[PDB]
Coordinates of C-alpha atoms and ligand atoms in Angstrom, one line a residue:
Chain F
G1 CA -19.1 -8.7 -18.1
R2 CA -18.9 -5.2 -16.6
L3 CA -17.6 -3.7 -13.4
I4 CA -19.5 -0.6 -12.2
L5 CA -18.4 1.9 -9.6
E6 CA -21.1 2.6 -7.0
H7 CA -19.4 4.6 -4.2
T8 CA -16.1 6.1 -3.3
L9 CA -15.2 6.8 0.4
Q10 CA -12.3 8.8 1.7
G11 CA -12.7 8.5 5.5
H12 CA -9.1 7.8 6.4
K13 CA -6.1 10.1 6.1
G14 CA -3.3 8.3 4.2
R15 CA -3.1 4.9 2.7
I16 CA -5.9 2.4 3.5
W17 CA -4.8 -1.2 4.0
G18 CA -7.8 -3.4 4.6
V19 CA -11.6 -3.6 4.3
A20 CA -13.9 -6.3 5.4
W21 CA -17.7 -6.9 5.0
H22 CA -19.9 -7.5 8.1
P23 CA -21.7 -10.9 7.9
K24 CA -24.9 -8.8 7.5
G25 CA -23.5 -7.1 4.4
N26 CA -24.8 -3.7 5.3
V27 CA -21.7 -2.6 7.3
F28 CA -18.0 -2.7 6.7
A29 CA -14.8 -1.6 8.5
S30 CA -11.6 -0.1 7.3
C31 CA -8.0 0.3 8.7
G32 CA -5.1 2.3 7.4
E33 CA -1.9 4.3 8.0
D34 CA -3.8 6.8 10.3
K35 CA -3.8 4.2 13.1
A36 CA -7.6 4.3 13.2
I37 CA -10.5 2.0 12.5
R38 CA -13.7 3.4 10.9
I39 CA -17.0 1.6 11.0
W40 CA -19.2 2.4 8.0
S41 CA -23.0 2.0 8.1
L42 CA -25.3 2.3 5.1
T43 CA -28.3 4.8 5.3
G44 CA -30.3 5.1 2.1
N45 CA -28.0 5.3 -0.9
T46 CA -25.0 6.8 0.9
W47 CA -22.3 5.1 3.0
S48 CA -21.1 7.0 6.0
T49 CA -18.9 6.5 9.1
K50 CA -20.9 6.0 12.2
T51 CA -18.0 5.5 14.7
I52 CA -14.3 6.2 14.7
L53 CA -11.9 4.0 16.8
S54 CA -8.6 5.7 17.7
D55 CA -5.7 5.1 20.2
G56 CA -6.2 1.4 20.0
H57 CA -2.9 1.0 18.1
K58 CA 0.3 3.1 18.2
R59 CA 1.3 1.9 14.7
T60 CA -0.3 1.2 11.4
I61 CA -3.3 -1.2 11.4
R62 CA -2.8 -3.7 8.5
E63 CA -6.0 -5.8 8.6
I64 CA -9.3 -6.0 10.4
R65 CA -11.6 -9.1 10.4
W66 CA -15.2 -9.6 11.5
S67 CA -16.3 -12.5 13.8
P68 CA -18.6 -15.1 12.2
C69 CA -21.2 -14.0 14.7
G70 CA -20.6 -10.4 13.7
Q71 CA -20.7 -9.0 17.2
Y72 CA -17.0 -8.0 17.7
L73 CA -14.0 -7.1 15.6
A74 CA -10.3 -7.8 15.7
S75 CA -7.4 -5.8 14.2
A76 CA -3.8 -6.7 13.4
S77 CA -1.4 -3.8 13.6
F78 CA 2.3 -3.1 13.3
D79 CA 2.7 -2.5 17.0
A80 CA 3.1 -6.3 17.5
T81 CA -0.4 -6.4 19.0
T82 CA -3.9 -7.7 18.0
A83 CA -6.7 -5.6 19.6
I84 CA -10.2 -6.9 20.4
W85 CA -13.0 -4.3 20.2
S86 CA -16.4 -4.9 21.7
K87 CA -19.8 -3.1 21.8
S88 CA -21.0 -4.2 25.2
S89 CA -22.2 -0.8 26.3
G90 CA -23.7 0.2 23.0
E91 CA -20.3 1.7 21.9
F92 CA -17.1 0.0 20.8
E93 CA -14.2 -0.2 23.3
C94 CA -11.0 -2.2 23.4
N95 CA -11.4 -4.8 26.1
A96 CA -8.5 -7.1 25.4
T97 CA -5.1 -7.0 23.7
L98 CA -3.2 -10.0 22.3
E99 CA 0.5 -9.6 22.7
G100 CA 3.3 -12.1 22.0
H101 CA 4.5 -11.4 18.4
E102 CA 8.1 -10.2 18.2
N103 CA 7.5 -7.9 15.1
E104 CA 4.7 -6.3 13.2
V105 CA 1.5 -8.4 13.0
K106 CA 0.4 -8.8 9.4
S107 CA -2.9 -10.7 9.5
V108 CA -5.8 -11.9 11.5
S109 CA -8.5 -14.5 10.8
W110 CA -11.5 -16.1 12.5
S111 CA -12.4 -19.8 12.2
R112 CA -15.9 -21.0 11.1
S113 CA -16.8 -21.9 14.7
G114 CA -15.7 -18.5 15.9
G115 CA -13.8 -19.8 19.0
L116 CA -10.4 -19.8 17.2
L117 CA -8.3 -16.8 16.2
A118 CA -5.1 -16.9 14.1
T119 CA -2.4 -14.3 13.6
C120 CA 0.9 -14.1 11.7
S121 CA 3.7 -11.6 11.9
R122 CA 7.1 -10.6 10.4
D123 CA 8.7 -12.8 13.1
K124 CA 8.1 -15.8 10.7
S125 CA 5.5 -17.2 13.1
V126 CA 1.8 -18.1 13.0
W127 CA -0.1 -18.0 16.3
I128 CA -3.5 -19.6 17.1
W129 CA -5.6 -18.3 20.1
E130 CA -8.5 -19.8 21.9
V131 CA -11.6 -17.8 22.9
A132 CA -13.5 -19.2 25.9
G133 CA -15.1 -15.9 26.6
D134 CA -14.7 -12.2 25.9
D135 CA -12.8 -11.8 29.2
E136 CA -10.6 -14.8 28.5
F137 CA -8.0 -15.5 25.7
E138 CA -5.6 -18.4 25.7
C139 CA -2.7 -19.1 23.3
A140 CA -3.2 -22.5 21.7
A141 CA -0.1 -22.9 19.6
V142 CA 3.0 -21.0 18.4
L143 CA 4.3 -22.2 15.0
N144 CA 7.5 -21.3 13.3
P145 CA 7.5 -23.3 10.0
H146 CA 7.8 -20.4 7.7
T147 CA 11.4 -19.2 7.0
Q148 CA 10.3 -15.6 6.0
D149 CA 7.7 -12.9 6.7
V150 CA 4.2 -14.4 6.9
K151 CA 1.8 -12.2 4.9
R152 CA -1.7 -13.6 5.6
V153 CA -3.7 -16.2 7.5
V154 CA -7.1 -17.5 6.4
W155 CA -9.3 -20.2 7.9
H156 CA -11.1 -23.0 6.1
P157 CA -14.8 -22.2 5.4
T158 CA -16.3 -25.6 6.4
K159 CA -13.6 -27.1 8.6
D160 CA -11.0 -25.9 11.1
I161 CA -8.1 -25.7 8.7
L162 CA -5.6 -22.8 8.7
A163 CA -3.9 -21.5 5.6
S164 CA -0.9 -19.1 5.7
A165 CA 0.9 -17.2 2.9
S166 CA 4.5 -16.1 3.4
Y167 CA 7.3 -14.0 1.9
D168 CA 9.1 -17.3 1.4
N169 CA 7.0 -18.0 -1.8
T170 CA 5.1 -20.9 -0.1
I171 CA 1.7 -21.6 1.4
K172 CA 1.2 -23.8 4.5
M173 CA -1.8 -25.7 5.7
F174 CA -2.3 -26.4 9.4
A175 CA -4.5 -29.1 11.0
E176 CA -4.7 -30.6 14.5
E177 CA -4.5 -34.3 15.1
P178 CA -7.2 -35.6 17.4
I179 CA -5.0 -38.1 19.2
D180 CA -2.2 -35.6 19.6
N181 CA -4.3 -32.6 20.7
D182 CA -1.6 -30.3 19.2
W183 CA -1.5 -28.2 16.0
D184 CA 0.8 -29.2 13.2
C185 CA 1.5 -28.4 9.6
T186 CA -0.3 -30.5 7.0
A187 CA 1.4 -29.6 3.7
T188 CA 3.5 -27.0 1.9
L189 CA 2.5 -25.5 -1.5
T190 CA 5.5 -24.5 -3.6
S191 CA 4.7 -23.1 -7.1
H192 CA 5.1 -19.4 -6.7
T193 CA 8.4 -17.8 -7.5
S194 CA 7.9 -14.8 -5.2
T195 CA 6.1 -13.5 -2.1
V196 CA 2.6 -14.9 -1.7
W197 CA 0.4 -12.0 -0.6
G198 CA -3.2 -13.3 -0.5
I199 CA -5.2 -16.5 -0.2
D200 CA -8.9 -17.3 -0.2
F201 CA -11.0 -20.5 -0.2
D202 CA -13.8 -21.4 -2.5
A203 CA -17.4 -22.0 -1.3
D204 CA -17.0 -25.7 -0.4
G205 CA -13.4 -25.3 0.7
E206 CA -11.8 -28.0 -1.5
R207 CA -10.1 -25.3 -3.7
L208 CA -7.9 -22.2 -3.1
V209 CA -6.8 -19.1 -4.9
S210 CA -3.4 -17.5 -4.2
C211 CA -2.0 -14.3 -5.5
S212 CA 1.7 -13.5 -5.4
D213 CA 4.4 -10.9 -6.2
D214 CA 5.2 -12.9 -9.3
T215 CA 2.2 -11.2 -11.0
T216 CA 0.3 -14.6 -11.1
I217 CA -2.6 -16.2 -9.4
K218 CA -2.9 -20.0 -8.9
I219 CA -5.7 -22.4 -8.2
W220 CA -5.0 -25.1 -5.7
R221 CA -7.1 -28.3 -5.4
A222 CA -7.2 -30.5 -2.3
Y223 CA -6.5 -34.2 -3.0
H224 CA -7.5 -36.7 -0.4
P225 CA -6.2 -40.3 -0.4
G226 CA -7.7 -42.6 -3.0
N227 CA -8.2 -39.9 -5.6
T228 CA -9.2 -41.0 -9.1
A229 CA -6.3 -39.1 -10.7
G230 CA -3.8 -41.3 -8.9
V231 CA -2.0 -38.7 -6.6
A232 CA -0.7 -40.4 -3.5
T233 CA 0.1 -38.8 -0.1
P234 CA 3.1 -40.4 1.7
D235 CA 1.7 -39.0 4.9
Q236 CA -1.9 -39.5 6.0
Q237 CA -2.6 -35.8 5.5
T238 CA -4.0 -34.3 2.3
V239 CA -1.9 -32.7 -0.4
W240 CA -2.7 -29.6 -2.5
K241 CA -1.6 -29.3 -6.2
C242 CA -1.4 -26.4 -8.5
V243 CA -4.0 -27.2 -11.2
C244 CA -4.1 -23.8 -12.8
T245 CA -1.8 -20.8 -13.2
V246 CA -3.0 -17.5 -14.6
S247 CA 0.0 -15.5 -16.0
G248 CA 0.4 -12.3 -18.1
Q249 CA -2.9 -10.9 -16.7
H250 CA -1.2 -8.5 -14.2
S251 CA 1.6 -6.0 -14.7
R252 CA 2.8 -5.9 -11.1
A253 CA 2.4 -7.6 -7.7
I254 CA -1.0 -8.9 -6.7
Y255 CA -1.6 -7.9 -3.1
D256 CA -5.0 -9.5 -2.5
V257 CA -7.5 -12.0 -3.9
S258 CA -11.1 -12.8 -2.9
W259 CA -13.1 -15.8 -4.0
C260 CA -16.9 -15.2 -3.7
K261 CA -18.9 -17.9 -1.9
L262 CA -22.1 -16.8 -3.7
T263 CA -21.0 -16.5 -7.4
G264 CA -17.6 -18.2 -7.5
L265 CA -16.1 -15.1 -9.0
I266 CA -12.4 -14.2 -8.3
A267 CA -11.2 -10.6 -7.9
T268 CA -7.6 -9.5 -7.7
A269 CA -6.1 -6.3 -6.2
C270 CA -2.9 -5.5 -8.2
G271 CA -0.1 -3.0 -7.9
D272 CA -0.9 -1.7 -11.4
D273 CA -4.0 0.0 -9.8
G274 CA -6.3 -2.5 -11.6
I275 CA -9.1 -4.8 -10.3
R276 CA -9.7 -7.9 -12.5
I277 CA -12.5 -10.4 -12.3
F278 CA -12.0 -14.1 -13.2
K279 CA -14.7 -16.7 -13.6
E280 CA -14.2 -20.5 -14.1
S281 CA -15.0 -21.7 -17.7
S282 CA -18.2 -23.6 -18.2
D283 CA -16.5 -26.7 -19.6
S284 CA -13.4 -26.5 -17.4
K285 CA -12.1 -29.8 -16.3
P286 CA -11.7 -30.6 -12.5
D287 CA -8.0 -31.5 -12.9
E288 CA -7.1 -28.7 -15.3
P289 CA -9.5 -25.8 -14.7
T290 CA -9.5 -22.9 -17.1
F291 CA -10.3 -19.4 -15.7
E292 CA -11.0 -16.4 -18.0
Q293 CA -10.9 -12.7 -17.2
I294 CA -14.5 -11.5 -17.8
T295 CA -14.0 -7.8 -16.9
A296 CA -11.5 -5.4 -15.4
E297 CA -11.0 -1.8 -14.4
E298 CA -7.4 -0.9 -15.1
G299 CA -7.9 2.6 -13.6
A300 CA -9.8 1.2 -10.5
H301 CA -7.7 3.4 -8.3
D302 CA -5.0 6.1 -8.7
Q303 CA -2.5 4.0 -6.7
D304 CA -2.0 0.4 -5.7
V305 CA -5.1 -1.6 -4.8
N306 CA -4.5 -3.2 -1.4
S307 CA -7.5 -5.4 -0.7
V308 CA -10.6 -6.7 -2.4
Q309 CA -13.5 -8.5 -0.6
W310 CA -16.7 -9.9 -1.9
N311 CA -19.9 -9.3 0.0
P312 CA -21.4 -12.5 1.6
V313 CA -25.0 -11.2 1.6
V314 CA -25.1 -9.1 -1.6
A315 CA -24.1 -11.3 -4.6
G316 CA -21.8 -9.4 -7.0
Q317 CA -21.0 -6.5 -4.7
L318 CA -17.2 -5.9 -4.3
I319 CA -15.3 -3.5 -2.0
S320 CA -11.7 -2.4 -2.4
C321 CA -9.2 0.1 -0.8
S322 CA -5.9 1.6 -2.1
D323 CA -2.9 3.7 -1.2
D324 CA -4.7 6.7 -2.8
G325 CA -6.8 6.9 0.4
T326 CA -10.1 5.7 -1.2
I327 CA -12.6 2.9 -0.5
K328 CA -14.6 2.0 -3.6
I329 CA -17.7 -0.3 -3.7
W330 CA -18.3 -2.0 -7.0
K331 CA -21.1 -3.9 -8.7
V332 CA -20.2 -6.6 -11.2
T333 CA -22.6 -7.9 -13.8
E334 CA -21.8 -11.2 -15.6
Chain V
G1 CA 3.1 -9.2 -19.3
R2 CA 2.9 -10.4 -22.9
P3 CA 3.8 -7.8 -25.5
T4 CA 1.0 -6.2 -27.5
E5 CA 0.5 -7.8 -30.9
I6 CA 2.4 -5.9 -33.5
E7 CA -0.7 -5.6 -35.7
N8 CA -2.7 -3.8 -33.0
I9 CA -2.4 -0.3 -31.5
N10 CA -4.2 0.7 -28.3
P11 CA -7.0 3.3 -28.9
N12 CA -6.3 5.2 -25.7
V13 CA -2.6 5.5 -26.8
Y14 CA -3.5 6.5 -30.4
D15 CA -5.9 9.2 -29.2
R16 CA -3.4 10.4 -26.6
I17 CA -0.8 10.8 -29.3
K18 CA -3.3 12.7 -31.4
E19 CA -4.1 14.7 -28.3
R20 CA -0.5 15.7 -28.0
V21 CA -0.6 16.7 -31.7
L22 CA -2.6 19.8 -30.7
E23 CA 6.0 28.9 -22.0
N24 CA 3.0 26.6 -21.8
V25 CA 5.0 23.7 -23.2
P26 CA 5.3 20.7 -20.8
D27 CA 8.6 19.4 -19.6
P28 CA 8.9 15.6 -19.4
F29 CA 10.6 13.8 -16.6
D30 CA 14.0 12.6 -17.7
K31 CA 17.1 10.8 -16.4
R32 CA 18.7 14.0 -15.3
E33 CA 15.8 15.1 -13.1
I34 CA 15.7 11.8 -11.3
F35 CA 19.5 11.8 -11.0
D36 CA 19.4 15.3 -9.4
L37 CA 17.0 13.8 -6.8
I38 CA 19.3 11.1 -5.6
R39 CA 22.9 12.3 -6.5
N40 CA 23.4 14.3 -3.3
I41 CA 22.0 11.6 -0.9
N42 CA 24.7 11.1 1.7
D43 CA 26.3 7.7 2.4
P44 CA 25.2 6.5 5.9
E45 CA 28.8 6.0 7.1
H46 CA 31.0 8.3 5.1
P47 CA 31.2 12.1 4.4
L48 CA 30.4 11.6 0.7
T49 CA 27.4 11.5 -1.5
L50 CA 26.1 8.5 -3.4
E51 CA 27.3 10.2 -6.6
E52 CA 30.8 10.7 -5.3
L53 CA 31.0 6.9 -4.4
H54 CA 29.4 6.0 -7.8
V55 CA 26.6 4.3 -5.9
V56 CA 24.1 6.2 -8.1
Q57 CA 24.8 7.2 -11.7
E58 CA 22.8 9.0 -14.3
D59 CA 23.2 6.2 -16.8
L60 CA 22.0 3.7 -14.2
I61 CA 18.5 5.4 -14.2
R62 CA 15.7 4.4 -16.6
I63 CA 12.5 6.4 -16.7
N64 CA 9.5 6.8 -19.0
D65 CA 7.3 9.7 -18.1
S66 CA 4.3 8.6 -20.2
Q67 CA 4.5 5.0 -18.9
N68 CA 4.7 6.2 -15.3
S69 CA 7.8 4.0 -14.6
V70 CA 11.1 4.7 -13.0
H71 CA 13.9 2.2 -12.5
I72 CA 16.9 2.9 -10.3
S73 CA 20.1 0.7 -10.3
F74 CA 22.5 1.5 -7.5
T75 CA 26.0 0.0 -7.0
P76 CA 27.1 -0.7 -3.4
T77 CA 30.7 0.3 -2.5
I78 CA 31.6 -3.3 -1.7
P79 CA 30.3 -6.7 -2.9
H80 CA 29.3 -7.6 0.7
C81 CA 28.0 -4.2 1.7
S82 CA 25.8 -4.5 4.9
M83 CA 24.3 -1.1 4.1
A84 CA 22.9 -2.0 0.6
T85 CA 19.3 -2.2 1.9
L86 CA 19.7 1.0 3.9
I87 CA 21.1 2.9 0.9
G88 CA 18.5 1.6 -1.4
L89 CA 15.8 2.5 1.2
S90 CA 17.1 6.1 1.3
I91 CA 16.7 6.3 -2.5
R92 CA 13.1 5.1 -2.2
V93 CA 12.1 7.5 0.6
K94 CA 13.5 10.5 -1.4
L95 CA 11.7 9.4 -4.6
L96 CA 8.6 8.5 -2.6
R97 CA 8.4 12.1 -1.3
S98 CA 9.7 13.9 -4.4
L99 CA 7.8 12.1 -7.2
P100 CA 4.1 12.2 -8.1
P101 CA 2.3 9.1 -6.8
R102 CA 1.6 8.0 -10.4
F103 CA 5.2 6.9 -10.7
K104 CA 6.0 3.3 -9.9
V105 CA 9.6 3.2 -8.7
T106 CA 11.8 0.1 -8.9
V107 CA 15.1 0.2 -7.0
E108 CA 17.5 -2.7 -7.5
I109 CA 21.2 -3.4 -7.0
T110 CA 23.2 -3.2 -10.2
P111 CA 23.5 -6.8 -11.4
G112 CA 26.6 -8.6 -10.3
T113 CA 27.8 -5.9 -7.9
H114 CA 26.5 -7.5 -4.6
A115 CA 26.4 -11.0 -3.2
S116 CA 22.9 -10.8 -1.9
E117 CA 21.3 -8.7 -4.6
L118 CA 18.3 -10.9 -5.1
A119 CA 17.5 -10.8 -1.4
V120 CA 18.1 -7.0 -1.2
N121 CA 16.0 -6.3 -4.3
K122 CA 13.1 -8.3 -2.8
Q123 CA 13.1 -6.3 0.4
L124 CA 13.1 -2.9 -1.4
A125 CA 10.3 -4.1 -3.7
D126 CA 8.1 -5.1 -0.7
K127 CA 6.1 -1.9 0.0
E128 CA 4.7 -3.4 3.2
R129 CA 8.1 -4.1 4.7
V130 CA 9.4 -0.7 3.5
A131 CA 6.4 1.0 5.2
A132 CA 7.0 -0.9 8.4
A133 CA 10.7 0.0 8.2
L134 CA 9.9 3.7 8.2
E135 CA 8.0 3.4 11.5
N136 CA 11.3 2.6 13.1
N137 CA 12.2 6.0 14.6
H138 CA 16.0 5.2 14.6
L139 CA 15.9 4.0 11.0
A140 CA 13.8 6.9 9.7
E141 CA 16.2 9.3 11.5
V142 CA 19.2 7.8 9.8
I143 CA 17.4 8.0 6.5
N144 CA 16.6 11.6 7.0
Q145 CA 20.3 12.4 7.6
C146 CA 21.0 10.9 4.2
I147 CA 18.1 12.7 2.5
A148 CA 18.8 16.1 4.1
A149 CA 19.9 18.8 1.6
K150 CA 22.7 21.1 2.7
Chain A
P1 CA -5.3 48.7 8.4
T2 CA -1.8 47.2 8.9
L3 CA 0.6 46.5 6.1
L4 CA 0.5 42.8 7.2
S5 CA -3.2 42.7 6.6
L6 CA -2.7 44.4 3.2
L7 CA 0.0 41.8 2.3
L8 CA -2.3 39.0 3.3
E9 CA -5.2 40.5 1.4
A10 CA -3.0 40.9 -1.7
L11 CA -2.7 37.1 -1.9
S12 CA -6.4 37.1 -3.1
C13 CA -5.8 39.8 -5.7
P14 CA -6.4 38.3 -9.2
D15 CA -3.6 40.3 -10.7
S16 CA -0.4 38.2 -11.1
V17 CA 1.9 41.3 -10.7
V18 CA 0.3 42.0 -7.3
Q19 CA 0.7 38.3 -6.3
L20 CA 4.4 38.2 -7.2
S21 CA 4.7 41.5 -5.4
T22 CA 3.3 40.5 -2.1
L23 CA 4.9 37.0 -2.2
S24 CA 8.4 38.7 -2.4
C25 CA 7.6 40.5 0.8
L26 CA 6.1 37.5 2.7
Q27 CA 8.9 35.1 2.3
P28 CA 11.5 37.1 4.3
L29 CA 8.9 37.8 6.9
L30 CA 8.4 34.0 7.3
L31 CA 12.1 33.5 7.7
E32 CA 13.0 36.4 10.0
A33 CA 9.7 37.1 12.0
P34 CA 8.3 33.6 12.4
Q35 CA 6.6 34.2 15.8
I36 CA 4.5 37.0 14.4
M37 CA 3.7 35.1 11.2
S38 CA 2.4 32.1 13.1
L39 CA -0.9 33.8 13.9
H40 CA -1.9 33.8 10.3
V41 CA -0.9 30.3 9.4
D42 CA -4.3 29.2 8.3
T43 CA -4.7 32.0 5.7
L44 CA -1.0 31.7 4.8
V45 CA -1.3 27.9 4.1
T46 CA -4.6 28.4 2.2
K47 CA -3.6 31.2 -0.1
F48 CA -0.1 29.9 -0.8
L49 CA -1.6 26.6 -2.0
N50 CA -4.1 28.3 -4.2
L51 CA -1.3 30.4 -5.8
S52 CA 0.8 27.3 -6.4
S53 CA -1.8 26.4 -9.2
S54 CA -1.9 29.8 -10.9
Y55 CA -1.5 30.2 -14.7
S56 CA 1.8 32.1 -14.1
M57 CA 4.9 30.0 -13.8
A58 CA 6.6 32.7 -11.7
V59 CA 3.7 32.9 -9.3
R60 CA 3.7 29.1 -8.8
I61 CA 7.4 29.2 -8.0
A62 CA 7.1 32.1 -5.5
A63 CA 4.1 30.4 -3.9
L64 CA 6.0 27.2 -3.3
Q65 CA 9.1 29.1 -2.0
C66 CA 6.8 30.5 0.6
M67 CA 5.4 27.0 1.4
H68 CA 9.1 26.1 2.0
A69 CA 9.6 29.2 4.1
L70 CA 6.6 28.4 6.2
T71 CA 8.5 25.5 7.8
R72 CA 10.6 28.1 9.7
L73 CA 7.5 28.8 11.9
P74 CA 7.3 26.9 15.2
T75 CA 6.7 23.2 14.5
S76 CA 4.0 22.8 17.1
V77 CA 1.7 25.1 15.1
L78 CA 2.4 23.6 11.6
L79 CA 1.7 19.9 12.5
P80 CA -2.1 20.2 12.3
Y81 CA -1.5 21.3 8.6
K82 CA 1.3 18.8 7.8
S83 CA -1.0 16.1 6.4
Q84 CA -3.1 18.3 4.1
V85 CA 0.0 20.2 2.9
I86 CA 1.8 17.0 1.9
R87 CA -1.3 15.9 0.0
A88 CA -1.7 19.3 -1.6
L89 CA 2.0 19.6 -2.6
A90 CA 1.7 16.3 -4.4
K91 CA 0.0 18.1 -7.3
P92 CA 2.8 20.6 -8.0
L93 CA 5.2 17.6 -8.0
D94 CA 3.6 16.8 -11.4
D95 CA 3.6 20.3 -12.8
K96 CA 4.3 20.8 -16.4
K97 CA 7.5 22.8 -15.8
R98 CA 10.8 21.5 -14.2
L99 CA 11.5 24.8 -12.4
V100 CA 8.3 24.7 -10.5
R101 CA 8.5 20.9 -9.8
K102 CA 12.0 21.6 -8.2
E103 CA 10.4 24.0 -5.8
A104 CA 7.6 21.6 -5.0
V105 CA 10.1 18.9 -4.2
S106 CA 12.0 21.3 -2.0
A107 CA 8.8 22.6 -0.2
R108 CA 7.2 19.1 0.3
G109 CA 10.5 17.6 1.5
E110 CA 10.7 20.1 4.4
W111 CA 7.1 19.4 5.4
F112 CA 7.9 15.7 5.7
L113 CA 10.5 16.6 8.4
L114 CA 8.1 18.4 10.7
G115 CA 7.2 15.3 12.7
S116 CA 10.7 14.0 12.5
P117 CA 12.6 11.9 15.1
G118 CA 15.6 14.2 14.5
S119 CA 15.3 17.6 16.2
Ligands
K1 K1 10.2 24.3 12.3

């Protein structure tokens, strides 16, 4: 396999934290240290910034995430707020602001349905919000299960399940009981020896990647009751198990991982400035899967690679950002 | 991760050594230069430098210019120093500003010299928490007092 | 024209002796007459950065010492340059000589303190 660099973008001033593809795949957004969000549209063969969003946050914007509808965008920043931007007038303005977190907000995520919004912060908490309209936002649950800084929140692709990665080396699943009408923690995943930075589900949603500060990525499989293997859940809820651990592939902490829903490829953003692509082996067993590194670009950036995101529309197109102040769009060929 | 097999030698390394085979002479980064960057950092609470309190020492610094790696080991004044993270943070900020970005800096407590060394090392190694800490105006001001040269 | 205009135009002279000559005059002017020097910040910042990458080790040193001396100008007029200067001064931090790297550390460190919580 080969990883090919297509474009390099330097819109922001300073380090760039997050990038995310629009569900149409022709537009992406980026946030960074400059406290500004840049919307990038593709005209011809060149990518360019069409709009610049400023003054929405007083502090650094860590992550931005598109709605499943793709109309409006939400940003988690260090000013303990999560801003909501909307293009109702043909131009993007900040209509609503979500406050409540005690410290810096680290992550946002949208559910598959699009009516649920989840945030996590350095206050060891994971919040879930309800969206009844653009003029209305209602807090659904405030959860404090994590003992340390919560790094990321990611929703399940097919179902309304929430996953959270934390500085406490653990991952936590969250599901709501129908009879109870309240959110609760489903299971706790404990195999990493250091901070869990990133998480991403596979296409169907029965598996999960996680990258951590321990320079390893792990594959988690969801086991429901009555599994053939023989794994039993003392509670009614499902349990996840570490069925694969890739080690020695990364020199430093892995800050982000993305699992493509079109190809099944896995990309990692490491602190050694390197992007690595992993693909599941052809004969890999469903209880002990084997993943092999097909291609990598050790000099993908001049500094730490902060985020990697596959394109939902264009198969094999990857985007990444780094502390060197660059956004790079890649094309992988198996 | 795993060490390179003894039978193999990396082509980029071999060529790069042959490139070096070919005033204008370059000066490599060494322990002394890094030590000169952190020796005069002031203690947050006392009118002494980290060198005078033996918090930083030249032989507690490891660096490889070619491999783009710097390791700093600092010894807190007391085994339960409540300023260990602040002191280690001042070292990072000075090195973050003074070193080329190609250098990956690791700042850890000298082993066995502090009760919470694992927890402190983990904070200083988290670039996100370090970045968020610098956006605290009171915290960045105290750091600048320690980093100031006079 | 004025001697100041001749000192500024001397920064573009390809001769290294002329560059070292005008730089030795500009640094005290930056330190003792900052209000007058602030009018020419754009050409001072531009030319000093170019000279910090000259073939001459002495020129690179003198150029960075002026970059340090620029921080004596009023802070309100330096801040629109603070970002690009910190990015530009990252290159002399990796210069092949210790003596010039030392000046790059000193100059860049003072440009970090322009937007500083401390006065
Ligand atoms: K000043």
